[PDB]
A and B are shown apart, each in its own frame.
Chain A
Amino acid sequence: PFDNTTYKNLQHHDYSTYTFLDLNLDLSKFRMPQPSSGRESPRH
């Protein structure tokens, strides 16, 4: 059934304060190992 009348983006009515950061915490496992500069910080 083709519909061009209803706004399908109703999910952002259900976003809380920590939604972005919990999505980041969920995506923390799918990611490649970060590159390293060879030192702990530019002050090390």
Chain B
Amino acid sequence: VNNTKKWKMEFDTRERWENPLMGWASTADPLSNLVLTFSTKEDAIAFAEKNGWSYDVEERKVPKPKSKSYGANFSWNKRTRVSTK
């Protein structure tokens, strides 16, 4: 999960087309490889507003905590028994 730790600012993808000579991915978007790293959401929002970039923000999706019980695999009356181990 070390790549979920920081906020990232990227841009919308523009057209990549085929090079007629080699089949390479030709682009005309200078910002197609620009990915910026930010520690918090508000730093990225401030950097986008400072540069006049219209932005959209997706909230951080942490996984909600689970309830893990090893003995639940071997219950007496619940469906949560494992059929094998």
> Interface of A with B (CB < 8 Å)?
37-39, 42-44
Partner of A43 from B75, B76, B77, B83 at Cβ < 8 Å: B83
Contact with A along B66-85 (1 / 0, CB 8 A): 00000000011111110100
Tell me whether chain B's interface is mostly helix, strand or loop, or mixed.
loop
Tell me the count of chain B residues lying within 8 A, CB to CB, of chain A.
8
Q: Which of A38, A39, A42 has the most CB of B within 10 A?
A: A42
Q: Are B77 and A37 in contact (CB under 8 A)?
A: yes
Taking Cβ atoms with an 8 Å cutoff, the residues of B that contact A are 75-81, 83
A residues in contact with B81, CB < 8 Å: 42
How far apart sit A24 and B42, CA to CA, in the bound complex (Å)? Answer: 74
